[PDB]
Design a protein around this ligand. Structure first.
Ligand SMILES: CN1C=C[C@@](O)(C#Cc2ccnc(-n3nc(C(N)=O)c4cc(F)ccc43)c2)C1=O
Length: 322
């Protein structure tokens, strides 16, 4: 009843506020409005404006697929964090509604969101350890124990999301961000995020093709499990130093995912029995037979123990891809 009036109060201003306010306001985003969820990012006289109240680093780098994430500093508090720019016309509400209010070490925290013209600027914690995606290029591929250690942590994050009926929609090494020392990993980029109970309808944006599940490619309905398929495509990416299918095929990798059997052949034979079996559960074509996050996280935990826990260093010597 009063919801109408609360939305109006938030509009036209940037305020220090709370996740529930941000979600309400964000829904209006299909001149300077927004909510900041942390003390460290303060608006000034109802405003928070690029190059006035917050400065993007003048060296200027570009993280993310579209060079859309940047290092930034709030001019007054001097607090540093990251900003994802989303085009306003493309902006999907779920990216925040999923992300907002979430408290978990396996998820990158949201610090707020502010609209300014054709942009939505989404603020978040800065992780200086880079992406798992960068780690793989850097070190070619990863050792079995490291690989399991991280997949487990990704799976821990997916549990959290699925308990709240949220689908990440694009699980992939690029979207797993590491800490300074590399002991902790967290999921980021909820730009394909959905709420749960068909998939292919209208304003929906699809994930990475190589990491895409069969039910999605074909078009059957989808559940939490589509993330599980991706997470294991990512497992393989960590082990072999390249995405599945790419080594074996050139033209349209989608039709290959549907017709061909799961790419379990890409599991290096030198993996332990359980490591291989865990991945096999995760990549079963049919969601009903495929494992859930809870089931796979448990199996992955076991496989790590089975190879004597996390031995190998965080910056081991480069290993050759397959
Ligand atoms: C909480 N939250 C708010 C917006 C969000 O949906 C995102 C994202 C995203 C997309 C691509 N890339 C990165 N990305 N961020 C960082 C960083 N925080 O330092 C980063 C660092 C890299 F090295 C590479 C990509 C990176 C982050 C989201 O999840």
């Amino acid at each position: 009843p009063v919801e109408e009036y609360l939305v109006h109060a938030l509009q036209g201003s940037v305020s220090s506020g709370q996740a529930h306010s941000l979600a309400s306001l964000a829904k209006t985003w299909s001149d300077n409005e927004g909510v900041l969820l942390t003390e460290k990012l303060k608006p000034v006289d109802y405003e928070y404006r690029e190059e006035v109240h917050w400065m993007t680093h003048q060296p200027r780098v570009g993280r993310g697929s579209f060079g859309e994430v940047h290092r930034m500093k709030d001019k007054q508090t001097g607090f540093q964090c990251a900003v994802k720019k989303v085009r306003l016309e493309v902006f999907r509400v779920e990216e925040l509604v999923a992300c907002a209010g979430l408290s978990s070490p396996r998820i990158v925290p949201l610090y707020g969101a502010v609209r300014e013209g054709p942009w939505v600027n989404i603020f978040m914690e800065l992780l200086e350890g880079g992406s798992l995606g960068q780690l793989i290029k850097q070190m070619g591929c990863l050792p079995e124990d490291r690989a399991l250690y991280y997949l487990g942590q990704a799976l821990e994050g997916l549990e959290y999301l699925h308990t709240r009926r949220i689908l990440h929609g694009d699980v992939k090494a690029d979207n797993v961000l590491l800490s300074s020392d590399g002991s902790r990993a967290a999921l980021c980029d909820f730009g394909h995020a959905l709420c749960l109970q068909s998939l292919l309808t209208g304003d929906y944006i699809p994930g990475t093709e190589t990491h895409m599940a069969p039910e999605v490619v074909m078009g059957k309905p989808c559940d939490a499990k589509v993330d599980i398929w991706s997470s294991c495509c990512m497992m393989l990416h960590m082990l072999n130093g390249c995405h599945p299918w790419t080594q074996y095929f050139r033209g349209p990798l989608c039709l290959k995912i549907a017709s061909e059997p799961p790419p379990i052949r890409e599991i290096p034979p030198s993996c332990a029995p359980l490591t291989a079996q865990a991945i096999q559960e995760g990549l079963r074509k049919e969601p009903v037979h495929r494992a859930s996050a809870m089931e796979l996280r448990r199996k992955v935990g076991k496989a790590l123990q089975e190879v004597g826990g996390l031995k190998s260093p965080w910056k081991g010597e480069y290993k050759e891809p397959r």
